[PDB]
């Protein structure tokens, strides 16, 4: 036969895979590729970033110097990890705007501390308590100095400390509220105390608050932690006549790329540049459906758990 036929066509596969389009909800194509990371490794990979396990401690307890959190004296981190099973085992306290202090330290990424020879004349220093047992003795938060009366009376303190550096000094202090007036006078002499921490651009006054609170370890009283930031060229001043839980020194504040993250997953050796509470995840896909809380180089969280991008033509078998 002196004629021929030349047919044109395309490929196909036994069973393809279904995708979304503008005009179809589902439609078969030869192949696809998943763009939503649904599943993590299980562990938090401590390789690309410097992950620091908190174990029994919070970041705040580590800063203040809880006897069991002494491990973290001068430690740093890209990501601090807080376990649900952590606790405080020192003198009971609170912090107004707690979250903010916690955020500021985590961001700085370091508990670099430098003590300073403050002069507390007319008062007995280094007060401790049974609720904060260190080793086997009545101690206190390592970064705070509990000031009490010196026999006869408790004078109006007036102490200064200028910032000579060119970075921000972070100061941590507080005030003591007793459970009774008979206690208030026993330790601080005066009927009502006061703490006035001021800079050349700012100030904060806290008045103590006598009256009993619930029983924590055996103590009825409390301590409220405050903080202050002194800028370059500026000067600190502390003026108290009672109840001052004084500072020992300052923390270094670095504008950093650090953070803190609550998790109970195993920290372990592996490759990854993205970290979640569920564990590390691979960041090859543009999106993820594991956990909105993330740190590092991460796919963006969305609500969908799957999206197939078509990498082939329409599939039409025979």
């Amino acid at each position: 036969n002196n004629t021929a036929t030349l047919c044109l066509g395309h490929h196909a596969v036994a069973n393809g895979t279904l995708v979304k389009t503008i005009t179809d909800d589902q439609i078969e194509v030869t192949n696809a590729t998943e763009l939503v990371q649904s599943i993590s490794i299980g562990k938090i990979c401590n390789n690309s970033y410097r992950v620091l396990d908190g174990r029994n401690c919070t970041l705040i307890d580590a800063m203040l110097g809880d006897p069991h959190c002494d491990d973290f004296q001068y430690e740093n981190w890209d990501l601090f990890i807080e376990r649900s099973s952590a606790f405080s085992n020192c003198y009971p306290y609170d912090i107004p705007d707690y979250a903010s202090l916690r955020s500021i330290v985590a961001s700085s990424g370091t508990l670099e501390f430098t003590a300073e020879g403050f002069t507390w004349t007319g008062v007995t220093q280094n007060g401790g308590s049974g609720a904060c047992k260190r080793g086997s003795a009545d101690s206190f938060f390592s970064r705070l100095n509990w000031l009490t009366k010196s026999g006869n009376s408790y004078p109006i303190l007036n102490v200064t400390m200028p910032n000579n550096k060119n970075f921000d000094k972070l100061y941590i202090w507080g005030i003591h509220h007793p459970s009774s007036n008979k206690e208030q006078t026993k330790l601080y002499i005066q009927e009502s105390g006061r703490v006035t921490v001021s800079t050349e651009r700012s100030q904060q006054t806290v008045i103590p608050n006598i009256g009993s609170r619930p029983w924590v370890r055996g103590q009825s009283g409390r301590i409220s932690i405050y903080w202050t930031i002194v800028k370059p060229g500026d000067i600190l001043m502390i003026n108290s006549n009672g109840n001052l839980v004084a500072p020992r020194g300052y923390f270094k504040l670095r504008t950093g790329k650090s953070s803190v993250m609550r998790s109970d997953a195993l920290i372990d050796t592996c490759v990854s540049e993205c970290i979640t509470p569920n564990g590390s995840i691979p960041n090859d896909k543009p999106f993820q459906n594991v956990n909105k809380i993330t740190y590092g180089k991460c796919p963006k969280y969305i609500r969908q758990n799957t999206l197939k991008l078509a990498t082939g033509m329409r599939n039409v078998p025979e």
Binding site: A4, V19, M313, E318
Partner: protein, 172 residues
């Protein structure tokens, strides 16, 4: 698709064609045969790999942000903290749902276009020596051996050589 070739005037795909995406099947004086077209196949793959490059391994680096889970009931500024994060998630969820939808729609259309581009390319080579049977098949009105088919695949087919023969078969 939009050119109406794939899942259109070509009835179905070939599972037997496993060495290429588009190609030819032909019978002649020497019998049947199959052969892939690398140029058309590769044009489609490059475009699909092109999309993959915009999507795969394009990832923003982020560090300390805002807290997204809360133990205590706080009110005003917690309400905001959540709403912010909720707004963000919805918008990215939409950006993702739309991206996939458009890219897939487009993928189908471009793969369909390459099919058609190859058909129109072949049609032009043959010129007056063949007719469009339908189903994307040509009746070549002359003896066209394997070597002859090869030139059609190679793009080197000279239509003048067989013109007088085929043209004579087409009308008589």
């Amino acid at each position: 698709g939009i050119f109406g070739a794939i899942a259109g005037f070509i009835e179905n795909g070939w599972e037997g064609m496993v060495d290429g995406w588009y190609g030819f099947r032909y019978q002649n004086s020497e019998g049947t045969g199959q052969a892939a077209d690398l140029k058309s196949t590769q044009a489609a793959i490059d475009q699909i790999n092109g999309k993959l490059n915009r999507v795969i391994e394009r990832t923003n680096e982020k560090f300390h942000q805002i807290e997204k889970e809360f133990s205590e009931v706080e009110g005003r500024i917690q309400d905001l903290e959540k709403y912010v994060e909720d707004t963000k998630i919805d918008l990215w969820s939409y950006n993702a749902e739309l991206l996939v939808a458009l890219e897939n729609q487009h993928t189908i259309d471009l793969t369909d276009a390459e099919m058609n581009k190859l058909f129109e390319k072949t049609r032009r080579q043959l010129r007056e020596n063949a007719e469009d049977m339908g189903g994307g098949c040509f009746k070549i009105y002359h003896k066209c051996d394997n070597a002859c088919i090869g030139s059609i695949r190679n793009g080197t087919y000279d239509h003048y050589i067989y013109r007088d023969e085929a043209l004579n078969n087409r009308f008589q």
